[PDB]
Swiss-Prot record:
Its EC number is 3.1.-.-. This is Flap endonuclease 1. GO terms for biological process: base-excision repair, gap-filling; DNA repair; DNA replication; DNA replication, removal of RNA primer; double-strand break repair; double-strand break repair via homologous recombination; memory; positive regulation of sister chromatid cohesion. Residues 102-228 are annotated as: I-domain. Its cofactor is Mg(2+). DNA binds at residues 57, 138, 206, 208. GO terms for cellular component: chromosome, telomeric region; membrane; mitochondrion; nucleolus; nucleoplasm; nucleus; protein-containing complex. One of its GO terms (molecular function) is exonuclease activity. Belongs to the XPG/RAD2 endonuclease family. FEN1 subfamily. Mg(2+) 2 binds at residues 159, 161, 208. It comes from Homo sapiens. It is an enzyme of class 3 (hydrolase).
Length: 308
C-alpha cells in the first residue's frame, strides 16, 4: 500500500471519495484482488477462514447483483536485474518492526497467503461458478487494467496502490459498513498532477517497492511534487546535509513498475458466471473441509437463486 494515501486524499481531495450502500450496485461487474481478499479473511477477528470468507462474502455480492471476477497474484515484480525479490522479504521487514513494539498492526503483516490457500480458493470459486484470472505479477495492477479496458466497473481491494497503478475506480470494503469508492480522475485534478507525478508522490509517501525520503512528510511531499513535478527535480535542489536521499534508491525502477506494470491481456478474458455445483460443493466444504452441511446447502441455494 501507499503510507497515508487514504488519509491524504480525505484532507486534500474529499470529493474523490464517496461512501455508498451495497444496494446501489445491482448489475455491476468488479475485479476483486483475490490475494489481498484472502489476506483480509485470514487476518480478521488448520484455519478455514479463507474458504469461509470466500464462500459467504461472494454469496453476499451475488445477492446484491454484483458480478465479481477474482484476480490472483503472479510472480512479484523485480526492480533490479541482479537480485531476486521475494514477497517474504516484506513479511521479514514486518517482523523487525513487530518485536520493537501498533503491535497488532505488524502482527497482521506477518500473515502469509499460502499455496494451499490459493488452490483451495480457486477450487471453491470453480465449484461456485465464479470466474477468476491469474495476473502475471501484482493482482492490484491487473485489477486496474481490467477497469481501464471497460471490462469491469471497479477494482475491489483494500490496497490503495491500485490507484497508483492507474485504476480509474477503486471500491473498498466490498468483502467486509458502506462501500468506499475512490475516483482517480478527481484525485489528479484536485492535486494538480498528472499520473506520472502522482506515481512520484506515492513513492515519497511510502510504497512497498522502495524507500521514501526521511524527513519529507506527506504535506511537504505534495508541495515538492506540485512545484518540481518529479523526484529527479526535487533531489537536484534539496540540501544534501538537511535531507539525504536513500543509499542505492530504486525510485526510478519503482516509477516504471507503477507506470508500465506487467498486467494480463483484458481482451484474452471472456468472463462467464455459471451455476454452482451443489453436489461437488457439499463434498468439498463438508466432506473434506468439515463445514456444516446445512450452512453450506443454504448458501448454495441463496447463490443459485441470485443468478435466476
Ligand atoms: C497478498 N497481499 C498480502 C498483503 N498485502 C499488503 C499488506 C502488507 C504490507 C507490507 C508488508 C506485508 C504485507 N500490502 C500490499 O500492497 C499487497 O499487495 C498485499 C497483498 O496483495
Ligand atoms: Mg500492493
Ligand atoms: Mg497486492
Amino acid at each position: 500500500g501507499i503510507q497515508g494515501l487514504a488519509k491524504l486524499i480525505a484532507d486534500v481531495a474529499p470529493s474523490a471519495i464517496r461512501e455508498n450502500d451495497i444496494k446501489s450496485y445491482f448489475g455491476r461487474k468488479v475485479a476483486i484482488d483475490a490475494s489481498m481478499s484472502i489476506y483480509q479473511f485470514l487476518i480478521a477477528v488448520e484455519t478455514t477462514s479463507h474458504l469461509m470468507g470466500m464462500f459467504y462474502r461472494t454469496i453476499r455480492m451475488m445477492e446484491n447483483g454484483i458480478k465479481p471476477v477474482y484476480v490472483f497474484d503472479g510472480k512479484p515484480p523485480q526492480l533490479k536485474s541482479g537480485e531476486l525479490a521475494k514477497r517474504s522479504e516484506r513479511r521479514a521487514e514486518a517482523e523487525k518492526q513487530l518485536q520493537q513494539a501498533e503491535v497488532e498492526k505488524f502482527t497482521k503483516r506477518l500473515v502469509k497467503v499460502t499455496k494451499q490457500h490459493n488452490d483451495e480458493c480457486k477450487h471453491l470459486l470453480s465449484l461456485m461458478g465464479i470466474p477468476y484470472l491469474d495476473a502475471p505479477s501484482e493482482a492490484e495492477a491487473s485489477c486496474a487494467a481490467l477497469v481501464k479496458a471497460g471490462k469491469v466497473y471497479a477494482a475491489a481491494t483494500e490496497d490503495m496502490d491500485c490507484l497508483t497503478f492507474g485504476s480509474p475506480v477503486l471500491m473498498r470494503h466490498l468483502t467486509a459498513l458502506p462501500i468506499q469508492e475512490f475516483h482517480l480522475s478527481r484525485i489528479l485534478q484536485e492535486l494538480g498532477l498528472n499520473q506520472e507525478q502522482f506515481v512520484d508522490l506515492c513513492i515519497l509517501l511510502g510504497s512497498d517497492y522502495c524507500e521514501s525520503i526521511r524527513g519529507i512528510g506527506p504535506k511537504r511531499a505534495v508541495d515538492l511534487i506540485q512545484k518540481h513535478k518529479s523526484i529527479e527535480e526535487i533531489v537536484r535542489r534539496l540540501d544534501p546535509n538537511k535531507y539525504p536521499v536513500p543509499e542505492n534508491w530504486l525510485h526510478k525502477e519503482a516509477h516504471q513498475l507503477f507506470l508500465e506494470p506487467e498486467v494480463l491481456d483484458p481482451e484474452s478474458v471472456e468472463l462467464k458466471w455459471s451455476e454452482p455445483n451443489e453436489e461437488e460443493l457439499i463434498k468439498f466444504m463438508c466432506g473434506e473441509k468439515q463445514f456444516s452441511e446445512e450452512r453450506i446447502r443454504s448458501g448454495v441455494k441463496r447463490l443459485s437463486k441470485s443468478r435466476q
